Amino acid sequence: MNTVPFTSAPIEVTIGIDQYSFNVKENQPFHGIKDIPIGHVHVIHFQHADNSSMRYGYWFDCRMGNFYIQYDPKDGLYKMMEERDGAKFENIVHNFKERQMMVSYPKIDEDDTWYNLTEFVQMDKIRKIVRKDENQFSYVDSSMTTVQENELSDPAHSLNYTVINFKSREAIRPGHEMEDFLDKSYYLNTVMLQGIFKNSSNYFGELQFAFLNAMFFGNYGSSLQWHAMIELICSSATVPKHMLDKLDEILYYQIKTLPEQYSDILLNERVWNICLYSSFQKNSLHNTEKIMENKYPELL
């Protein structure tokens, strides 16, 4: 079990870790989060009490180093940093635990939600989508745009998700115009699975990371990317049975975890009604379909 200490809490902020979050008052003595389950990626994220605009946060993995949060009064935000001095860090951490200034990552033991949301998410892959190779952790916020979004402006701050576009040469073989557009099996399995992602786990990882960026930061371009990767699977007539069963699980926990009041902007009516009711895989998403219906029958 690992710790992310905080130097201070100078400004009133709602801090989240994964799907948990705490209200922290201005100069409340808050000094970190402890008992963070080793073995998954995590995200610590922030929404200042004064600016309910710009949710931001850091993806990290505690195995990849010792990380702490410090408020920057120039740049105006909680910054993740890495402490290289292992001793100086166990020192900080143990002294804050003793003084009991740290919240416990509040995992219920029965609860696999975070594992299920992050099953396929690797920090090595996050760091390719969010390119900043001098940090082992990855900054994402509400306003970051995706590589696809920019094409249609600052590349240093972009989300380099894999471009998916159903009306592109990549997606459509010359001579199979009608086939490949009605049945994206080619684009999914040869171009994307075999070609770009290499395997289904990297694909599911990007999908899952895109969902989480949408949920935690309302990153609209991640939402687009999550919906694209679902639609590409659902619009392929020929999908490995294992990807289909895993996908139903993935989406179930994502739909399960979404705040109820957000279903309007995070969930795209067309994609879901097509995936659950019109696509080749209409009948392959039983869990995802059941929860969607009993929880958002309006959208449908």
Binding site: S168, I172, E177, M178, F181
Partner: protein, 237 residues
Amino acid sequence: GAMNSSNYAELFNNDIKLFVDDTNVYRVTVHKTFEGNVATKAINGCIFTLNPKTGHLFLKIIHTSVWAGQKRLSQLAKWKTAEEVSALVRSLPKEEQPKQIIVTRKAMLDPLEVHMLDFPNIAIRPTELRLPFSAAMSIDKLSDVVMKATEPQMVLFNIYDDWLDRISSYTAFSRLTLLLRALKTNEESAKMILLSDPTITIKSYHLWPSFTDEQWITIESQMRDLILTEYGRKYNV
């Protein structure tokens, strides 16, 4: 964006554009089988691709043989249209390739778009206009060439005959859409109006009678009256 009443005159500028109407690509008679069930029989159809500025019509004849052993034909028809339009574009020299293609039915946008991926500088556009291009098979010579065809065949026509020697594209297109609109609303009367006078013939290289200018005015009046009448009947106005 979508073509409508507002940007109507863009059709007659010097940007090469074509209309594609797919309404007559997949044509069936619906009949009963011995057992009493309904079955369709395909007849020859055509793609109606028309440069509204010049009157050049690329009548791509769609031979029934293209449907043989195919399912979901009304869907295939849109892709076959789009495939044939794309091949027409590819066949034209660069300076003749259109800058826009305006499909008269929105269902054609994606098939055409996907077929035109090799031509990204060609805009595929819908229209809000209710163009009467479906009545192209009420033009005798066009219907005849489609029906007699025994293979896939492209037939070139100038749908304005020689009108452009005496009128503008804009007027030419308006005359055409009025004829076709009347042909569409009451074919029998529209054709009656067109031939009632045995002394006005259609030249072998033309589609429409050789009316003088004054006789075109009378014709246009007669088609307008026809169209207005049919409306009252339709709606009881």
